[PDB]
Amino acid sequence: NLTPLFEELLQQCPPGGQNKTAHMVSAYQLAQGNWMPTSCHVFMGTISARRTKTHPYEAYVKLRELVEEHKMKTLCGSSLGKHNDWIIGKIKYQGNLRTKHMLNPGKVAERHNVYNKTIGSVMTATGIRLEKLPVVRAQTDTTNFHQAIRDKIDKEENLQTPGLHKKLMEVFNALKRPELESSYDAVEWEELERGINRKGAAGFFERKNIGEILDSEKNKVEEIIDNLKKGRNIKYYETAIPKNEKRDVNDDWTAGDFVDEKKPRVIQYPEAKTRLAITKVMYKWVKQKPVVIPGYEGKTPLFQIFDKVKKEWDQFQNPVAVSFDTKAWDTQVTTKDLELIKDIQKYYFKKKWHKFIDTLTMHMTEVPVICADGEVYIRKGQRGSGQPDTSAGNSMLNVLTMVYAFCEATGVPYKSFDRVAKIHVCGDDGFLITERALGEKFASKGVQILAAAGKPQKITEGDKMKVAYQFDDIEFCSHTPIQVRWSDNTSSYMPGRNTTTILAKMATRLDTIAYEKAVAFSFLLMYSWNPLIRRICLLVLSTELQVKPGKSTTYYYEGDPISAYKEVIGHNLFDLKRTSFEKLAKLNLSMSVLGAWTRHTSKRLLQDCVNMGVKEGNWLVNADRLVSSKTGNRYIPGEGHTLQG
């Protein structure tokens, strides 16, 4: 017989759930005969069968090949990353993504923009053709979306020069802050929850959102935080959706409608529980609570971005400004990069939390991404746009690279950098200010030094970087400095943009007079230099003064808007005596070329304001310097303040 040898193997064939769905044969009944396996896992002494007339040896022949098969797949395989192997389970279909430079194992089982009633109506009444105004919320087809991944996302990590990331540390070793070293730690549930979008998007396998995760399974996030701190691999996946998909939702407050506009076609975001797990821990770094990365303006509000800068620009014997057009930055992040920012995080975080960093970064190098339609792909490094670390990390990266490029092109020591240039960034977008001498070197030798670093500039001109020679040619956060002159003869620069582009952003929604006002106040803080837009905002704010403003847009106001504006701008809207002559030409010209306004549109808006603030009394529209001037009245405003979120 053969049983005494069948008992040998069975104490080695793997365990299983005793399943009655078929024929579980006996530890000896195998040597009987005609009882050959069709499956292996043992139920404390059974396997499958087939009644296939097998010989008491043909059984052992077959089974032992399954044990060889099992001891093979398991234990003694490859692919899909060394930590990401879990994702093979959730596959069901073979995958059509046609990706040439990264994996693609299969697929899984799988917001219109409307007009602002009041604000739109205001515009038309003056001659503004909304038909002739840019569309600023277009979506994208999935056919087009699929090609967006191949065109932009599937690529091998750029070639970053030998011993570069040592020089980048060499750089960060100048701008480090020993006063905070090994100090950061997790934040409590209140400080995290204070500013948090209760409707923050959920991962592909999730069903609740940021709020509900907070409401109910707060302990589930405490798990993700524990294991990561202890050193364990966590099921890290990212989800990928197109831009302006219903699930493109910011967990933090945007200081402008430009942030969601400097977004990439392809948004990659981790499970919402995982967004919290990272953030209750890395809050001090990711939000950048103390600000550590020099020149990071992501916490600065838009109205002072340029006021603050012109205080620097006005110090250089002869200053120039140079821009950073990194071609689709996010897909230009190598794995040594993410390992650099990793070391940084560990410079400021405590000792207990390094493992967290150590672990989380490992996952962030080999990232499985599930698409909207189920098509999972593996990302070759790079930054997912919706990761908590995006603004925080990306920015550190930008200055370190760009410092490196600036010193590498000019020979200025990394230590002596602040003595010869100033740097402002905002994630990947930024610029740098220095003398005409130095700027020109960095301007030409820059496209090269930078492509050499894996951060390739755009197509540009003759391979020179973008150089701003006069201050009001700078671009930043998608706005440009325009200058205003006040009652008291002072100058001060405001955040300029194109009139058409503002009217487009302002009239449109995304699937409510109180909201329409909060928009017109939020637009006034930035665009009061633009009289067409100033007069519009006053005309809207002055409607339905009963109705308190809404709170879902960038800013809003508590009390008398013209007093709130005063609190944040440091000047009364009435004090706006003149807007820069030439710079207002440029930003208004788009309007004549698209034909969005008429000869009569300028005067007609003003007349509506004078027609309104002429009746005896204290009328909002009279906040405009000229309106009040020809309407004889003035606006006497009560206590008012500015808020956000």
Author numbering: 13 to 88, 90 to 123, 131 to 531, 538 to 671
What does the article say, verbatim?
Compared to the RdRPs of other Flaviviridae representatives such as the NS5 of the Japanese encephalitis virus (JEV) and dengue virus (DENV) in the Flavivirus genus and the NS5B of the hepatitis C virus (HCV) of the Hepacivirus genus, the pestivirus NS5B contains a unique ∼90-residue N-terminal domain (NTD) that does not have notable sequence homology to any other viral or host proteins. The global conformation of our CSFV NS5B structures is consistent with the recently reported CSFV structure with an RMSD value of 0.9 Å (95% coverage) between the reported structure and our representative C-682 structure. These structures together reveal that the NTD adopts a globular α/β fold with an α-β-α-β-β-α pattern. The NTD interacts with the palm of the RdRP core intra-molecularly with a mixture of hydrophobic and hydrogen bonding interactions. Collectively, these biochemical data indicated that the RNA synthesis fidelity of CSFV NS5B is fine-tuned by its NTD through the intra-molecular interactions with the RdRP palm.
To better understand the nature of the NTD–RdRP intra-molecular interface interactions and whether they regulate the RdRP fidelity, we designed point mutations at the Y471 and E472 sites in the context of the WT NS5B and the N- and C-terminal deletion mutants. The other two structures, obtained using the C-672 construct bearing the Y471A-E472A double mutation (C-672_AA) and the C-672 construct with the E472A single mutation (C-672_E472A), were solved in a space group different from those of the WT, C-682 and C-672 structures. Very interestingly, the C-672_AA and C-672_E472A adopt a drastically different global conformation with the NTD–RdRP interface no longer maintained (C-672_AA structure shown in Figure 3D). The NTD–RdRP intra-molecular interactions are fully disrupted, and the NTD is rather involved in a non-intensive three-way interaction involving two symmetry-related neighboring NS5B molecules in the crystal lattice. As suggested by the two open conformation crystal structures (C-672_AA and C-672_E472A), the NTD–RdRP disengagement might occur in solution. In the chromatography analysis, the crystallographic open conformation C-672_AA and the C-672, or the AA mutant and the WT, had consistent retention volumes. By carefully comparing the proteolytic profiles at representative time points for all three constructs, the AA mutant also produced a few proteolytic products that either had obviously different amount from the WT or were consistent with the characteristic products of the N-91. These observations suggest that though the closed conformation is dominant for the AA mutant in solution, the open conformation AA mutant likely exists in solution as a minor fraction.
